[PDB]
Design a binder for this molecule. Structure first.
Ligand SMILES: CN1CCC[C@H]1C(=O)O
Ligand SMILES: CN1CCC[C@H]1C(=O)O
Ligand SMILES: CN1CCC[C@H]1C(=O)O
Ligand code: FES
Ligand code: FES
Ligand code: FES
Ligand SMILES: [Fe+3]
Ligand SMILES: [Fe+3]
Ligand SMILES: [Fe+3]
Lengths: 414, 414, 414
């Protein structure tokens, strides 16, 4: 399948010549092949994008309990996120300072201390090394605490940054707070998590996400509740339609922030968009999936709070529940997408919601997107693939993403 | 197995130094290791051989119907071959000009138009882009038709060439026509297709094919019907035995071209050779597999029309049925071989032929060749492998192939 | 799992700069990441370590019979070891001198001659080419015998060396003989063989082996019979404890060599160490596994003859049976470990020993070590991994190994 096509295609590819490629790039066109297929560009994307920008990791409700921890891989990093004894959430490199071992092997759990499974070096939940067996009298444990990972809490959503010099997160955090706080995400629980691998480059997953040019043919279930190019894109940035604005006004008159806002540098966007017709949620019948709402959004037909933050996440926060999506790179032609359904912590499965009803729409959607992304990746692997033009009407959000990515890479290579 | 051996062997391999290796090559010896094992030479073989020469794709009878199409991968290219509305067979790159997607996902089918599954850009069966949704009023669809692939019809067998500057095909086509036309291949149907992966370099598959030095020990079934070094090789090029010539004369007196002919540059060869003993076909009992013949070959014991055309194909055309073989590179140590059994279009399975009887000999043979090729590849992966001498008597066809390959590569690197 | 982590980690790794890394290395610290993760260092480890030093292959009792042979892969080499007609054991490259094929496909067997399966070139059991079909009258078979592999017999254990210029083996052989001869290994048979792949670099397998810092937490079964840092390491090299020396004296008064000895260059070590408490063998109850002993070791509580010889082997020779361990590199993050249980040739399964009782302890131990090695490898793959300090008390044997490896590599690159 794709693994072999990947190998075949890179055999005859011309040199990456990344500066030349970046120089000649036009914003109205899809990217030249090696951006989507080459290990050279993939290495750059890790080094300069995923290892430098803030990334969505997990909802904070996953760390509700004392000594609770969750682990994730970002590229080659293995990160552990923990609720320390002081109630603070902190992140560390999941690598013992002795000989490097993973410390936490499970995806989630609770501990009293972080105990290396190899020789039992023992760390407090704030990373300090509190016991190391037989290291001699001049061993200085202060030099051998776990390495910290920069971490922020975005109103109930934990973000991390693998750089020692992280970019400004406060601008985004301040902008987003009014929109997110009404969802009370700190009072959520995880109802369901779905993790899939899509056999396409992470950028193809994002280009796919940033348009609904493909949705009428490809997403029967989603199309019952998700609408219009102005919804899914960014042409509302140059000015809002009267019908859309009336929706924003209904939300905001009711005390729910809605207005479309786009970062200066294009990194992130928030907008609370209307749903189709009379739909209220992402369900097959269009009605709320959960009877006990997560948050205080009003009115009931407030629709979907769309939030993207490149490179890691897109999100849908509805009046009754929320969904977060985490995009993580696996190889030049593979990307991991993790979808997390968030419901009120006291919402009871089988009473306030049905698992199938809650998840079926986006399970189906994700599978459809995956098939499309994978088909797109396979064609791109041809040596005959050349950039093609994006639709100005239907793909302005795709251009906006690709521009963000190219600018980010350019700045990092300067 | 071989995948790991491949990785191990390339770790310590000396530099490819391809010009030096080509310089010191002697025609009487097998090739130095990296020709058979290195990704560097494999990349060259794709770029300079498979992407530059004409290649056998499929029988034209697979495209008998209106709107019919078949897809194939050549290296990293994905090609679609289609019967257009004017009755002409044409080939295209199976990559949408929008964002690159595969258009035809199935191996075979029928369509009215080529409709991209992603955003439904729609193409006529001659590649023209006839509808693109919402591209703006200055989109010029004339610039965005599917990219054509050079295609020839060799008397019922479709050949393609991935280069914008294809080599001369007419010399071969003219030579071959008299031999092939008597098989009426345009009136065939595909009775059976077998696709296997052999874990050896494509050149090892060809060296294996071009001798019967290995056949008495390794091919019990084939040896009941397939003969003698003069059959399988090229020593008839310097002059024909009296017994072989008498066979050619029996065929040709009956109006069936037979005489051994070898290209100037060694690319191709045709000869109608006698079968063993009293055999008439490649079956366990030696009798015709199919009672309704494909073509008008006479006499009934005309034997096998051998045709090879490097790098893609060898073929056996018998009085009752025909077999085509397509060799396609998968990685430095993997090669795809596709065997196609062709019978008269009106021959009925279970009445005029039995599927098992028709296919069992060459299914077995291919499996035996595969085991041999794979065993050979595994030994070659050793760093202790050094070229060895070919048998002048039994491997003159192997030398002839290796000479063609080296000359072709030399010319392409000049 | 690890395969993908390997790929991710090498994408962003800094250049290998092997001389600089070797220059700055401190003996008290674990190695910088690329020693354990990079294909560049793995290639060096093959070229300069595994392809240059003597390596443990198999016990000679596996070649007891006339025409008997055994095959093994070392890196990319395929080696065949054979008992020739003169009774001598010899090794060859398992690659036919014609076109390179493997000759012996099975792991073990008996033959009269070595017959290539491809075109039946036939070799005597001392490698001479005695028949080649149809090679012409000026073919000189004297030039086309199998390529020999340097081979030594270490008191019943066959060692090989892939270099044309092997290092001195006699120093080790002379030192080891008194300790090994009392085990009568030439009179052994193989009771059981276990081959596992551990997903860590070969060096991580060795560092793991060379300490029991991890054993109390990780090896419940082994800890019932295997003891103390002085046992498993090398601090007895600077001087022996009174309790350990008393053990050596009990052995040696009984005519069984025991005293700790360490090579000048650190390559190898032999010591006959006491077992825990009252244990006599590696069994769950601590009693002898086999009632008919392999060899003449006395007293019955002589304990374990530990022998390591880098890079290929560690070994435990007990009064009742013996175990050999062979370490072979598979990729930068994979290593093959082969454990061989040796018992007296006349010991009868189900009468003198029970297979489960004999093997269960070290089957369990190996599986525990494997899990630990693999967990360690996964943490090391993080870009945040940095060298950490070894315990002077508990890891002196780890330092000693890493010093041997670094010195060996330095000398080979000079
Ligand atoms: C349209 N894009 C943005 C939202 C949904 C996604 C998709 O088509 O599934
Ligand atoms: C002998 N070669 C050429 C024809 C058949 C092939 C083989 O041995 O199967
Ligand atoms: C302690 N090392 C050396 C001997 C045993 C090995 C282990 O812990 O299994
Ligand atoms: S690797 Fe963690 S204590 Fe040794
Ligand atoms: S990729 Fe084909 S229409 Fe968009
Ligand atoms: S490869 Fe061994 S005889 Fe030909
Ligand atoms: Fe979609
Ligand atoms: Fe064959
Ligand atoms: Fe252990």
């Amino acid at each position: 399948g794709t693994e072999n096509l990947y190998f075949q295609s890179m055999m005859t590819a011309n040199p990456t010549s990344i500066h030349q490629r970046l120089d000649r790039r036009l914003s109205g066109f899809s990217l030249e092949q090696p951006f989507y297929t080459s290990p050279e560009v993939y290495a750059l994307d890790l080094q300069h994008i995923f290892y430098k920008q803030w990334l969505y990791a997990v909802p904070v409700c996953q760390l509700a309990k004392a000594g609770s921890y969750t682990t994730l891989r970002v590229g080659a990093y293995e990160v552990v996120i923990v609720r320390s004894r002081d109630g603070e959430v902190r992140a560390f490199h999941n690598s013992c300072r002795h000989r490097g071992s993973l410390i936490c092997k499970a995806r989630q759990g609770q501990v009293a201390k972080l105990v290396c499974p190899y020789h039992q070096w023992t760390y407090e939940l704030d990373g300090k090394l509190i016991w190391a067996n037989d290291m001699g009298p001049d061993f200085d444990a202060s030099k051998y605490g776990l390495k910290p990972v920069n971490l922020r809490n975005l109103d109930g959503l934990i973000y991390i940054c693998l750089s020692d010099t992280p970019p400004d997160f406060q601008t985004f955090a301040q902008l987003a707070r009014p929109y997110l706080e009404v969802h009370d995400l700190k009072d959520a629980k995880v109802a369901f998590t779905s993790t899939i691998i899509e056999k396409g480059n992470w950028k193809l997953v994002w280009e796919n996400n940033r348009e609904c040019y493909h949705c009428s043919s490809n997403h029967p279930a989603l199309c019952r509740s998700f609408p219009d190019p102005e919804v899914a894109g960014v042409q509302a940035d140059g000015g809002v339609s009267k019908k859309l604005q009336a929706h924003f006004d209904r939300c905001e008159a009711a005390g729910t922030p809605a207005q479309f806002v786009l970062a200066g540098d294009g990194q992130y966007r928030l907008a609370r968009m209307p749903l189709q017709e009379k739909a209220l949620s992402y369900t097959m019948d269009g009605k709320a999936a959960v009877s006990r709402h997560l948050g205080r959004v009003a009115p009931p037909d407030a629709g979907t709070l769309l939030m993207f933050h490149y490179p890691s996440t897109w999100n849908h926060f509805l009046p009754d529940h929320s969904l977060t999506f985490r995009v993580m790179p696996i190889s030049p032609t593979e990307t991991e997408v993790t979808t997390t359904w968030l419901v009120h912590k006291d919402a009871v499965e089988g009473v306030d919601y049905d698992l199938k009803r809650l998840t079926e729409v986006w399970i189906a959607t994700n599978d459809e997107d995956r098939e499309i992304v994978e088909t797109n990746q396979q064609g791109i692997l041809s040596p005959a693939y050349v950039p093609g033009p994006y639709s100005p009407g239907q793909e302005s959000g795709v251009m906006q993403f690709v521009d963000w990515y190219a600018a980010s890479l350019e700045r990092a290579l300067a």
